[PDB]
Amino acid sequence: PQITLWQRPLVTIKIGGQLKEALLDTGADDTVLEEMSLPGRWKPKMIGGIGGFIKVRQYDQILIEICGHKAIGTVLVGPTPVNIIGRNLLTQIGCTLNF
Amino acid sequence: PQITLWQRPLVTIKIGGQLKEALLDTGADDTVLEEMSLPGRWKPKMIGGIGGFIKVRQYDQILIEICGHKAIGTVLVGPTPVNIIGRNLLTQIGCTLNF
């Protein structure tokens, strides 16, 4: 699609068989989901935002579908206000800023 | 003009004389700027993301020239990591997301 910014950019992702709304987020390097059950192992990551830094759990090669589009990347699980879909998976699904 | 998200999306912004650069960010509702002093009165606000909340000074109808193009709107001045160009001015310069 073509998504305008007058409304917040929520889209349905589908991770592990459940639907969730995540935000299309260009200000973000990574994809940061709220606390959930990812499969396998994790490693620790420091990631800062606006309030500053936080410790996340990182899962590699997670298959998340986004508006019926498949990415296989690195998902960070942590305390975010909302589900962030960041640059890492936006490049995967061929997302561009247009003006 | 398609912008790719291979790299963090940073544009020049001309503000009060100055040429600064900011991040085009679909995750931000409002525009936050490095601590500076705008003309007029402000309303204090708390904006929070990852790592929590910070305290900004709201200034309504501030003219930003975002990579050539002008946009009026509210601008927050606070302790931000990076100047952020949010959804507020983005639509103004008719920015959109595609895939």
Binding site: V32, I47, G48 | -
Partner: peptide, 4 residues
């Protein structure tokens, strides 16, 4: 915004 989300860095690092």
């Amino acid at each position: 915004l989300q860095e690092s």
